[PDB]
Amino acid sequence: FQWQRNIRKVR
């Protein structure tokens, strides 16, 4: 839940 659609911004 912390990044299920946000890993390319949080690289």
Q: Are 3 and 10 in contact (CB under 8 A)?
A: yes
Give residues preceding each break in the chain, C–N over 2.5 A: none
Least distance (Å) between residue 5 CB and ligand DAO: 8
Least distance (Å) between residue 4 CB and ligand DAO: 4
Least distance (Å) between residue 9 CB and ligand DAO: 13
For ligand DAO, give the closer residue by CB, 3 or 9.
3
Residue 7 CA to its chain's centroid (Å): 3
Q: Which positions touch ligand DAO (CB under 6 A)? A: 1-4
Residue with tokens 């911004």: 9
